[PDB]
Tab-separated table of C-alpha atoms and ligand atoms in Angstrom:
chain	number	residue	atom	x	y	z
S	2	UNK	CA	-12.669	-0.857	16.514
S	3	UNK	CA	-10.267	1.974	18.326
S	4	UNK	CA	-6.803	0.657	18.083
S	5	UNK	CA	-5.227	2.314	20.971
S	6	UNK	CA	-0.718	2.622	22.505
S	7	UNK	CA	-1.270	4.031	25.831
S	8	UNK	CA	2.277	5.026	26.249
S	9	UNK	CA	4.176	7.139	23.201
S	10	UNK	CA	7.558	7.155	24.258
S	11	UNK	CA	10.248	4.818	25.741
S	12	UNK	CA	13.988	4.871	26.154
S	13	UNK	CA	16.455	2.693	27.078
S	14	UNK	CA	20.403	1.624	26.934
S	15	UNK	CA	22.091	-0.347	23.534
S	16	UNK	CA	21.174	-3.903	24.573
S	17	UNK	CA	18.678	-3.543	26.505
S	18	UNK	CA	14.922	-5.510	26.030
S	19	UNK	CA	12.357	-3.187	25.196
S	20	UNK	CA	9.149	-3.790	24.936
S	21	UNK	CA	5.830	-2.116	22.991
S	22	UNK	CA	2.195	-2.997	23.683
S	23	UNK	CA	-1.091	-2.241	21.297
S	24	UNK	CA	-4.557	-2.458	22.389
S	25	UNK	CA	-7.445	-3.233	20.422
S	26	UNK	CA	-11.494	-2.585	21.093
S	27	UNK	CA	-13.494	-5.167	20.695
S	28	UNK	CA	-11.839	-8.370	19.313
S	29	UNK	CA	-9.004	-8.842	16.535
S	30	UNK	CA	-8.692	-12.723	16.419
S	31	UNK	CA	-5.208	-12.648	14.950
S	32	UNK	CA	-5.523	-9.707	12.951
S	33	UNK	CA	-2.369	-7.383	13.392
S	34	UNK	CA	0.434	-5.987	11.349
S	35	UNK	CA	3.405	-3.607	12.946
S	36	UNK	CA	4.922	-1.208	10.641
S	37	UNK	CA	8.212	0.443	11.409
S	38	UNK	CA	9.259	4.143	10.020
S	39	UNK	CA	12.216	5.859	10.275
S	40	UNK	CA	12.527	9.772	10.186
S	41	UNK	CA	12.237	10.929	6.732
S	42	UNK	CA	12.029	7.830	4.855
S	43	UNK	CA	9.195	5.199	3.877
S	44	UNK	CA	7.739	2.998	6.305
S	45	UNK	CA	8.277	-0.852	6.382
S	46	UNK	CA	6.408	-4.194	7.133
S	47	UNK	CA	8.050	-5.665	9.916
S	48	UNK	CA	5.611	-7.971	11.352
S	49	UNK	CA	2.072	-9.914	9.688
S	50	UNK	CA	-0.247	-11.692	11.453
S	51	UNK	CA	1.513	-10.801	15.346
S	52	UNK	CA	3.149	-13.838	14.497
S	53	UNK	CA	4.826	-14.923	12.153
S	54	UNK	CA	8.371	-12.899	11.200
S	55	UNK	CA	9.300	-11.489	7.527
S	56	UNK	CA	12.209	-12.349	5.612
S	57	UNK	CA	15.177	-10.106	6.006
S	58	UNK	CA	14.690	-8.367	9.352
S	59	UNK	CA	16.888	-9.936	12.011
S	60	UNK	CA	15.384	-12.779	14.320
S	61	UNK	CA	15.791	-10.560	17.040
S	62	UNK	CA	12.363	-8.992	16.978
S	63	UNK	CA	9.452	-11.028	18.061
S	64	UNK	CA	6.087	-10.053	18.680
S	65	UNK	CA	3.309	-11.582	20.650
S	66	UNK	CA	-0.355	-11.666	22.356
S	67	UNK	CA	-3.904	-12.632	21.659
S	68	UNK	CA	-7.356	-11.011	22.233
S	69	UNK	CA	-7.030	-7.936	23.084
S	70	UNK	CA	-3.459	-6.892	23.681
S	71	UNK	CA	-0.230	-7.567	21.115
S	72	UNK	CA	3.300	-6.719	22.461
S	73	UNK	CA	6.422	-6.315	20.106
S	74	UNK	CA	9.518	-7.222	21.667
S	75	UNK	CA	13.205	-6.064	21.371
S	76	UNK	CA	15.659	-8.572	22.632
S	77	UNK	CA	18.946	-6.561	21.690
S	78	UNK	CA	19.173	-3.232	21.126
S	79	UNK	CA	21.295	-1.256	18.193
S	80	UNK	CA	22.395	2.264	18.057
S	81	UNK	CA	20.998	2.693	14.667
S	82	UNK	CA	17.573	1.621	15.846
S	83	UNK	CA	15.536	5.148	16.539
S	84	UNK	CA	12.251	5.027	14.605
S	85	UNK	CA	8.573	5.037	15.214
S	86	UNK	CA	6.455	2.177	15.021
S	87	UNK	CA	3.010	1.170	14.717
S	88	UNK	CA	0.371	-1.074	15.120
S	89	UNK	CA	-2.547	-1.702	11.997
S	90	UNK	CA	-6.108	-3.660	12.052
S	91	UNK	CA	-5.995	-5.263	8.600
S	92	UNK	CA	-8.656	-8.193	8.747
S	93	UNK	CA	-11.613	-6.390	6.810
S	94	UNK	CA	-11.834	-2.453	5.426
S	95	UNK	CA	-11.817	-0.474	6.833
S	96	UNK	CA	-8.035	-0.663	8.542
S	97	UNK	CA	-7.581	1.814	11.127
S	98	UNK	CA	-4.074	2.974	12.146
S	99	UNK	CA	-2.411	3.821	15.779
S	100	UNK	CA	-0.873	6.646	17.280
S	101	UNK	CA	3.033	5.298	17.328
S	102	UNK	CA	5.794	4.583	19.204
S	103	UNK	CA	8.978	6.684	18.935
S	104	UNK	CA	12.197	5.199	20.636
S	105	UNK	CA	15.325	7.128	22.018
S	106	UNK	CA	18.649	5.654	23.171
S	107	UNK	CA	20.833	7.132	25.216
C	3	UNK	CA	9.384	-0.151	-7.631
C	4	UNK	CA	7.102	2.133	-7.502
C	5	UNK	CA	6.948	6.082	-8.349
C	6	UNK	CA	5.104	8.700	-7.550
C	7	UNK	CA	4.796	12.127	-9.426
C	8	UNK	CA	2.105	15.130	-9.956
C	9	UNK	CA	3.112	16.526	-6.282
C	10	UNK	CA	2.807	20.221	-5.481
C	11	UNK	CA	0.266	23.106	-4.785
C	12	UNK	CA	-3.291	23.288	-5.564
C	13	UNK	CA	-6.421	26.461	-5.242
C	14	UNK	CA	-8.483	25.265	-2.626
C	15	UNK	CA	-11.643	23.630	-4.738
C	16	UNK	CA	-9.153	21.894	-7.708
C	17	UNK	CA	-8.780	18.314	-8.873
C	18	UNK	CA	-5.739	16.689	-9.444
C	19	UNK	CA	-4.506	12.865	-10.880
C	20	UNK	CA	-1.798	11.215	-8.844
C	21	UNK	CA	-0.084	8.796	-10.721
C	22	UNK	CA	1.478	5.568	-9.497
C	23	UNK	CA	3.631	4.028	-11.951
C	24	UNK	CA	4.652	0.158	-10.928
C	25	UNK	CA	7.562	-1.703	-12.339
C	26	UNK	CA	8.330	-5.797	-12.209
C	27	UNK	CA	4.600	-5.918	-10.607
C	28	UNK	CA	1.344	-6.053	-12.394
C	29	UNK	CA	-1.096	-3.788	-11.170
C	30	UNK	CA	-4.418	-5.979	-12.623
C	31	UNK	CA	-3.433	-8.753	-10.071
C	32	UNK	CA	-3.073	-7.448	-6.797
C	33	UNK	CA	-4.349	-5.486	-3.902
C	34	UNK	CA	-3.516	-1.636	-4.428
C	35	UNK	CA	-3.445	0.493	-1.164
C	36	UNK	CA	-3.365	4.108	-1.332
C	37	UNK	CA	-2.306	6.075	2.253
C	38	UNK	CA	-2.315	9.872	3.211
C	39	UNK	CA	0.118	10.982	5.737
C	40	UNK	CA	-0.174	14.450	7.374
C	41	UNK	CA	2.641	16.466	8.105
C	42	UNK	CA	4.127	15.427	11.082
C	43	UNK	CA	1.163	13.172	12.171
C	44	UNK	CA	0.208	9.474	11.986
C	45	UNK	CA	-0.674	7.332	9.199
C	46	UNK	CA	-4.105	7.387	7.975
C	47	UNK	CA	-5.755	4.630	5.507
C	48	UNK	CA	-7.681	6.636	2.411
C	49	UNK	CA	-8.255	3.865	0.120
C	50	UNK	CA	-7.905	0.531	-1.511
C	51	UNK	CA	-8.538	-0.975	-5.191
C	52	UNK	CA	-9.159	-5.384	-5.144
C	53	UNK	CA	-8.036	-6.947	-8.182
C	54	UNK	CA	-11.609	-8.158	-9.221
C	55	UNK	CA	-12.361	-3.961	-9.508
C	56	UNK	CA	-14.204	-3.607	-6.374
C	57	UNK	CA	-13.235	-0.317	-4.360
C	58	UNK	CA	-13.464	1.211	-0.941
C	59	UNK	CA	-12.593	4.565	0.630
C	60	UNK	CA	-12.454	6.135	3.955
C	61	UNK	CA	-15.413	7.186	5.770
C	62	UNK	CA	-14.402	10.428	6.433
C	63	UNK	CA	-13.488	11.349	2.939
C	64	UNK	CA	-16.250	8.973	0.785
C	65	UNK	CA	-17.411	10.717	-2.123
C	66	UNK	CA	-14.867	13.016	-3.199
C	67	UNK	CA	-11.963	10.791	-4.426
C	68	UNK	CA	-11.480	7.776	-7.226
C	69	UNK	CA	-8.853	5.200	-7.514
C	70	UNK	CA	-8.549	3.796	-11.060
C	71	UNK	CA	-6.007	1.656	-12.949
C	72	UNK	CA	-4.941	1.547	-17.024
C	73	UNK	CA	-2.956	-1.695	-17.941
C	74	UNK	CA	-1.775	0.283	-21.557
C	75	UNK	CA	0.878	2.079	-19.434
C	76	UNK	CA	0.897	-0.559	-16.149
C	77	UNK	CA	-0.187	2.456	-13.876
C	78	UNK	CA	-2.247	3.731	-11.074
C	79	UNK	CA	-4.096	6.844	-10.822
C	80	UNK	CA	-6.328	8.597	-8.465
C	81	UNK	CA	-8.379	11.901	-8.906
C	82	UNK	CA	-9.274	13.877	-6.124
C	83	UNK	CA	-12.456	16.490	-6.451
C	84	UNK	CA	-14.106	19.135	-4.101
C	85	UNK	CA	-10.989	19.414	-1.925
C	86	UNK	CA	-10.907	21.522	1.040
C	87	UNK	CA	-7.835	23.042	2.927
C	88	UNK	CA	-6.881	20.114	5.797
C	89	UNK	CA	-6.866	18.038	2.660
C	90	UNK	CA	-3.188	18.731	2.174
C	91	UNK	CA	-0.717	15.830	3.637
C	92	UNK	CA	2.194	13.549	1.858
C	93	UNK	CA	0.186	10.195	0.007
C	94	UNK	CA	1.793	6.736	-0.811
C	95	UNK	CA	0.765	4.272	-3.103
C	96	UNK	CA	1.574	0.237	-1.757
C	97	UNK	CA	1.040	-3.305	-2.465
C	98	UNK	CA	-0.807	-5.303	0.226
C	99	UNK	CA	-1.710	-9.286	1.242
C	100	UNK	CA	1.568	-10.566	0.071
C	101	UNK	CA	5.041	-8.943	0.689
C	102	UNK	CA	4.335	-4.889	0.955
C	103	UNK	CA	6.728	-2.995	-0.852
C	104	UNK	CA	5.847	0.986	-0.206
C	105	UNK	CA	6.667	3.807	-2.602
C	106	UNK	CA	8.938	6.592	-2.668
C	107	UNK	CA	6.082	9.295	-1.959
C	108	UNK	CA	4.458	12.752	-3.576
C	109	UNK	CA	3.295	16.034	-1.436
C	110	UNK	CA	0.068	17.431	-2.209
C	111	UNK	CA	-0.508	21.019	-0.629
C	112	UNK	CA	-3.282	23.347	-0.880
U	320	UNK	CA	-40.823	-38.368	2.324
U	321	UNK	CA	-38.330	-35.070	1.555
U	322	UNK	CA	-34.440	-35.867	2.059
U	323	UNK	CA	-34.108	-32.474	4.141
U	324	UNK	CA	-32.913	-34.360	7.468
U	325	UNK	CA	-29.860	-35.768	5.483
U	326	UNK	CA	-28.025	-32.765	4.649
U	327	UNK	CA	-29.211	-30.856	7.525
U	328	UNK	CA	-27.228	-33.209	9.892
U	329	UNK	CA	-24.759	-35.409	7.505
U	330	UNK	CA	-21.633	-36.439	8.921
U	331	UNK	CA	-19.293	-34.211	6.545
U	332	UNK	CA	-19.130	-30.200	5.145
U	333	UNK	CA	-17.502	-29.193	2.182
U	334	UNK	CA	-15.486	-26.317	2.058
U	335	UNK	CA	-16.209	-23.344	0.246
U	336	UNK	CA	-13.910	-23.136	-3.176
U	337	UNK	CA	-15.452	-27.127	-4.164
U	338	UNK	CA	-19.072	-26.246	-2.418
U	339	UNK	CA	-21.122	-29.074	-3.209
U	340	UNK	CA	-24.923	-28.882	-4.276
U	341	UNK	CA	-27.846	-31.441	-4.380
U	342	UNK	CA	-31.226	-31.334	-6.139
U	343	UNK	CA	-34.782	-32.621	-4.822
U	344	UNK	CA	-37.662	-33.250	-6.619
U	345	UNK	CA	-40.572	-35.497	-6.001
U	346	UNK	CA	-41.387	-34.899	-1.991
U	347	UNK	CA	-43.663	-33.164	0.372
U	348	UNK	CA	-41.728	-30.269	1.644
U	349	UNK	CA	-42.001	-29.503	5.891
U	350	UNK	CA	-40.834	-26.193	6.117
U	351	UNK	CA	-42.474	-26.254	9.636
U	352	UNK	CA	-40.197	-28.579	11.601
U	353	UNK	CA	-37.309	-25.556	10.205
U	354	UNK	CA	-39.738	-22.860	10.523
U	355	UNK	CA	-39.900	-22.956	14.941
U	356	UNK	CA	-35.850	-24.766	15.738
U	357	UNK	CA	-33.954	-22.612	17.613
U	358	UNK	CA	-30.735	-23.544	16.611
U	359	UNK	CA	-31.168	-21.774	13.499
U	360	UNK	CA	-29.382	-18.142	14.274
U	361	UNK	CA	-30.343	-16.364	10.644
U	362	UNK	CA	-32.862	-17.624	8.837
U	363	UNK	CA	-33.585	-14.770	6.562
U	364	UNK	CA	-35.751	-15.408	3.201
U	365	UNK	CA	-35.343	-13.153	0.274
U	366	UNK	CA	-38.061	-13.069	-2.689
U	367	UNK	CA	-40.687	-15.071	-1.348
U	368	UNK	CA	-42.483	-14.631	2.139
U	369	UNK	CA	-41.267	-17.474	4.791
U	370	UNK	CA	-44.862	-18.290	5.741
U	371	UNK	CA	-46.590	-18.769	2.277
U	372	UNK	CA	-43.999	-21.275	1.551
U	373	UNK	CA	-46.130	-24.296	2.708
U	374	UNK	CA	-49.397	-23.446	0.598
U	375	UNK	CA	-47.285	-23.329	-2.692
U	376	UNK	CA	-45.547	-25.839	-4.168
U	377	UNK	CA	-42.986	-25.797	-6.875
U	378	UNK	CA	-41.083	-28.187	-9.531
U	379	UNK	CA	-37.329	-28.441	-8.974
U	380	UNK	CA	-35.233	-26.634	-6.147
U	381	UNK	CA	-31.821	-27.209	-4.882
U	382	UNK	CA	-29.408	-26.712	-1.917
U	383	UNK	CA	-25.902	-25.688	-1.267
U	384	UNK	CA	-24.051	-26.037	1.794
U	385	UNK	CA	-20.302	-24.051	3.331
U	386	UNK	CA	-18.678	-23.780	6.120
U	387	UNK	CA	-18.007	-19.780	6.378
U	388	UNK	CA	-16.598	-17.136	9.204
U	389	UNK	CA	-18.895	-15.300	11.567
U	390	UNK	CA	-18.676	-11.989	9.456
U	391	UNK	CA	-19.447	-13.032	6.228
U	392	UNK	CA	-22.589	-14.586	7.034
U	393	UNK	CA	-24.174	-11.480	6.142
U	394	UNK	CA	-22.318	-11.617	3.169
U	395	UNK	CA	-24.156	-13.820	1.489
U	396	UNK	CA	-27.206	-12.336	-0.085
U	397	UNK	CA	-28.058	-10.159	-3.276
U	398	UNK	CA	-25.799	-7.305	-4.697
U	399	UNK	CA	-23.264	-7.677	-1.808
U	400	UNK	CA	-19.283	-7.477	-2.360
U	401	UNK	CA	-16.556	-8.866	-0.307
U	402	UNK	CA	-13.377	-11.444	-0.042
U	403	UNK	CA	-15.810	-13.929	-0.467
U	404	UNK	CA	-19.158	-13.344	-1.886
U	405	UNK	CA	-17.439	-12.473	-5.408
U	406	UNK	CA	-14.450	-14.839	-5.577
U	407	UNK	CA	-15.903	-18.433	-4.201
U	408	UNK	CA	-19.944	-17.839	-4.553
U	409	UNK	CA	-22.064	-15.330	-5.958
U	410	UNK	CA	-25.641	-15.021	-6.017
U	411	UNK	CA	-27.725	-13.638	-8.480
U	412	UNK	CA	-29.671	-9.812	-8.000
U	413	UNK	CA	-33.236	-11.541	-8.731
U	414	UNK	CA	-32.671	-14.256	-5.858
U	415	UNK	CA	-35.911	-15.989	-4.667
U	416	UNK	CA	-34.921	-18.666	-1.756
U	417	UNK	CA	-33.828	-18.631	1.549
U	418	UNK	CA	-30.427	-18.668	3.501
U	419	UNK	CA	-30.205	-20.711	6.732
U	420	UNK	CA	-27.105	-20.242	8.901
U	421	UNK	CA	-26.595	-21.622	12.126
U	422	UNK	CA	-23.735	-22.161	14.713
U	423	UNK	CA	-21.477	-24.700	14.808
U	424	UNK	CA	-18.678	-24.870	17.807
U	425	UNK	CA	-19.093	-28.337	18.392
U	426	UNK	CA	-19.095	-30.422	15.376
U	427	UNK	CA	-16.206	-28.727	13.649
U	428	UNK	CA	-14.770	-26.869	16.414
U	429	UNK	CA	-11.068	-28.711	16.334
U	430	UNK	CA	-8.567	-28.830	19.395
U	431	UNK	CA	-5.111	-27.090	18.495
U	432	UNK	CA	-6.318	-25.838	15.386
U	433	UNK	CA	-8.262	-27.090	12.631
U	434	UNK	CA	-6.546	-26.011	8.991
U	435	UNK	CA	-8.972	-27.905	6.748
U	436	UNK	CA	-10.942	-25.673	6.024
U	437	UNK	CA	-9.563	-23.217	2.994
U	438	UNK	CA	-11.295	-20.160	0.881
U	439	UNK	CA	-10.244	-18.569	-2.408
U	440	UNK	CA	-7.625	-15.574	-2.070
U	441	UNK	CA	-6.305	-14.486	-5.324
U	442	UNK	CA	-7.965	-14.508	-9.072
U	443	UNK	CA	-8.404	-12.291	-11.966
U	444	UNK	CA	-11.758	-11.959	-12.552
U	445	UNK	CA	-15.184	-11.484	-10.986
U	446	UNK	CA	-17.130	-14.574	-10.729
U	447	UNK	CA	-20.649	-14.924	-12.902
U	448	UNK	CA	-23.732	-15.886	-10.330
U	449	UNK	CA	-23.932	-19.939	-9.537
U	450	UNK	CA	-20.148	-20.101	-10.740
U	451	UNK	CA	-17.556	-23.143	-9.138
U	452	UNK	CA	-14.030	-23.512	-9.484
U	453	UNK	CA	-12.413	-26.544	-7.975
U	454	UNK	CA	-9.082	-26.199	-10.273
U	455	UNK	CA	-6.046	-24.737	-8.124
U	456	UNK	CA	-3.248	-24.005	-10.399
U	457	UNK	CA	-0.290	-21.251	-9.572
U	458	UNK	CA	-1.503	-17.947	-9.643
U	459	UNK	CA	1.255	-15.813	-11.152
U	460	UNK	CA	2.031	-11.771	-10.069
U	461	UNK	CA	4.403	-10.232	-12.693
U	462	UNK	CA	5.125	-11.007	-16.309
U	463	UNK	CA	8.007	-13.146	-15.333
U	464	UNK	CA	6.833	-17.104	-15.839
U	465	UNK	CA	6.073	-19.372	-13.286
U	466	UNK	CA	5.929	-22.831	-14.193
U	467	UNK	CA	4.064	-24.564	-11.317
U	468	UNK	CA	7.284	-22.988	-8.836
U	469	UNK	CA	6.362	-21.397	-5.508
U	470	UNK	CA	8.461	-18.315	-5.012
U	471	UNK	CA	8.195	-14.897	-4.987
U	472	UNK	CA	5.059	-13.648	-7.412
U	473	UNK	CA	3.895	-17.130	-7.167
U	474	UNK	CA	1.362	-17.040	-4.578
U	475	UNK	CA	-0.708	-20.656	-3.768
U	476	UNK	CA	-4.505	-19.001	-4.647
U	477	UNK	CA	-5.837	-20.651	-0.949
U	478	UNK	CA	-6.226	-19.637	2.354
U	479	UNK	CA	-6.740	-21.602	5.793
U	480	UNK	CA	-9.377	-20.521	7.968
U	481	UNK	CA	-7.934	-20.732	11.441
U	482	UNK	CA	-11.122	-22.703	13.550
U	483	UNK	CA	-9.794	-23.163	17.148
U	484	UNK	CA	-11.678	-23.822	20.517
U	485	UNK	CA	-11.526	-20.300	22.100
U	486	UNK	CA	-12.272	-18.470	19.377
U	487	UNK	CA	-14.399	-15.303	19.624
U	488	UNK	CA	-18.069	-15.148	18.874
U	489	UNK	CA	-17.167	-13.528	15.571
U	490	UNK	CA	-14.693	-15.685	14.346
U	491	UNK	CA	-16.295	-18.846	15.610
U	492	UNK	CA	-17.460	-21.257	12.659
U	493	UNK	CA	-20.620	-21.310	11.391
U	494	UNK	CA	-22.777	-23.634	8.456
U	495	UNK	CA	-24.772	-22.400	6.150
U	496	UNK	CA	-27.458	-23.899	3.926
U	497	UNK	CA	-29.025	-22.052	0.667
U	498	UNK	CA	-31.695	-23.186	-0.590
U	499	UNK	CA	-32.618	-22.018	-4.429
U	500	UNK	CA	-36.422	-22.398	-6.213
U	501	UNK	CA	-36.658	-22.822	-9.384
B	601	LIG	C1	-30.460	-33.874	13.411
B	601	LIG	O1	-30.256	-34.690	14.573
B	601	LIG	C2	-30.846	-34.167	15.771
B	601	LIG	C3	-30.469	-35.121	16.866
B	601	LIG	O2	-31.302	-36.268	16.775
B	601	LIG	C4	-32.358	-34.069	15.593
B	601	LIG	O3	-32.903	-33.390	16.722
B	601	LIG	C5	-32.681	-33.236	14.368
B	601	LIG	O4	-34.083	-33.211	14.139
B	601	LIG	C6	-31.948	-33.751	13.131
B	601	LIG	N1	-32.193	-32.849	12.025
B	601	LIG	C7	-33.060	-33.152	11.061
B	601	LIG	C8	-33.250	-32.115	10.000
B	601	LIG	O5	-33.652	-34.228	11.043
């Protein structure tokens, strides 16, 4: 299992829809988390399961896919929203990591 | 909460024991996940403790660290041995299968 | 006449936390019909050679049944540890029997999503071999007390296997059958 983001960095407007995509060898059923970290601090569960949405972050995010590839979705963007994000197999040990996303406004 | 402490340098070939000290959570009753970070890099997994006791480590890096828990003091410690120079990079010490709560962080350089 | 063909095709599988278990005594067993079916995917035998189980016959033995995912089917067998060989069944380092698993995507295999289905997540302690739980109180997370509320620290100690249609091969339901010799 070789948890794979082909692209590793996209920009956009504020308010724009941006969107993320994670690919997975082999087969994760359902089996996805996507952490977000901002510079300097300590990263944060945003997303278990691909699914289903934590409490406190706004409803705004979404995520989505099956099989093979996941996608994490942006509806509205925020100017305090640069960070790096990633994408974690965590059905059995061992759980391997990605490479991350790092997002730029302008 | 969580803190971390014991963070600094190390002679290549030391040992060290990172402690995790919990608060408001019981570390004999949940999933304990312990993550190295190099400097600059992506996240990498290095181990995790079950509550029943069991263990598992990294494949790259089986065989030279321990995870361990004491319930006198409600902490979490791990003890590195044989180290080598790449070994270096910032670790974290989280909760994990029910609301992950990550802690502050220590840097461990050779 | 042995009982074999009743739980090897009754109507109804328990789940894994309440796993059932029946005792036969007093029959002629026929390993052989079991010993050529195909349907049978791992029919692995630990202890006692699968062949030499014919000419011998013994006093009491017994048989277990679950319903389990397509990874931990390897899972169960001696000095193994896992999310589900410690916490919902154990078996013991000296085992002499045999462990028949086969596939299952048409029986069981709901539309839309079964969620009957449910294994043991949370508990404090290793479990001793041939060990069953069926009680499902609040498991608690912090010294702060519970009293049979769901909240935060107060975790439900279950978890629903997600069986659907288009499942992958690995993730696809499968029954298993242990059989135990005294
Ligand atoms: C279960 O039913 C099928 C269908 O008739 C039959 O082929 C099979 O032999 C039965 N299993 C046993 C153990 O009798």
């Amino acid at each position: 299992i070789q948890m794979t983001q082909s692209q590793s960095s996209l920009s956009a407007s504020v308010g724009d829809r941006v969107t993320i995509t994670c690919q997975a060898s082999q087969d994760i059923n359902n089996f996805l988390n996507w952490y977000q970290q901002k510079p300097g601090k300590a990263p944060k569960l945003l997303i278990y399961d691909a699914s289903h949405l934590e409490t406190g972050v706004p409803s705004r995010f979404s995520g989505s896919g099956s099989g093979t590839n996941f996608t994490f979705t942006i509806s509205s963007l925020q100017p305090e929203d640069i960070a790096t994000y990633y994408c974690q197999h965590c059905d059995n040990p061992p759980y391997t990591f990605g490479q991350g996303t790092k997002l730029e406004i302008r | 909460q969580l803190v971390e402490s014991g963070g600094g340098l190390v002679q290549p070939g030391g040992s060290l024991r990172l402690s995790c000290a919990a608060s408001e959570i019981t570390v004999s009753s949940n999933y304990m996940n312990w993550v190295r970070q190099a400097p600059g890099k992506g996240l990498e997994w290095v181990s995790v403790i079950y509550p029943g006791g069991t263990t598992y480590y990294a494949e790259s890096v089986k065989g030279r660290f321990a995870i361990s828990r004491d319930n006198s003091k409600n902490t979490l410690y791990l003890q590195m041995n044989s180290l080598r120079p790449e070994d270096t990079a910032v670790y974290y010490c989280a909760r994990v299968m029910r609301h992950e709560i990550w802690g502050q962080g220590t840097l461990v350089t050779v | 006449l042995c009982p074999f063909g009743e739980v090897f095709n009754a109507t109804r599988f328990a789940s894994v936390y309440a796993w059932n278990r029946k005792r036969i005594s007093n029959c002629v067993a026929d390993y052989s019909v079991l010993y050529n079916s195909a349907s049978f995917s791992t029919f692995k035998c630990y202890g006692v050679s699968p062949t030499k189980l014919n000419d011998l016959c013994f006093t009491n033995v017994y048989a277990d049944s679950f319903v389990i995912r397509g990874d931990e089917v390897r899972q169960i067998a001696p000095g193994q540890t896992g999310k589900i060989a410690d916490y919902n069944y154990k078996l013991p380092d000296d085992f002499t029997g045999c462990v028949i698993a086969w596939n299952s995507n048409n029986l069981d295999s709901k539309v839309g999503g079964n969620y009957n289905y449910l294994y043991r997540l949370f508990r404090k302690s290793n479990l001793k071999p041939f060990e069953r739980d069926i009680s499902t109180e609040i498991y608690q997370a912090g010294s702060t007390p519970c009293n049979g509320v769901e909240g935060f620290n107060c975790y439900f100690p279950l978890q629903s296997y997600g069986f659907q249609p288009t499942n992958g091969v690995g993730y696809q339901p499968y029954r298993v059958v242990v059989l135990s010799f005294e």
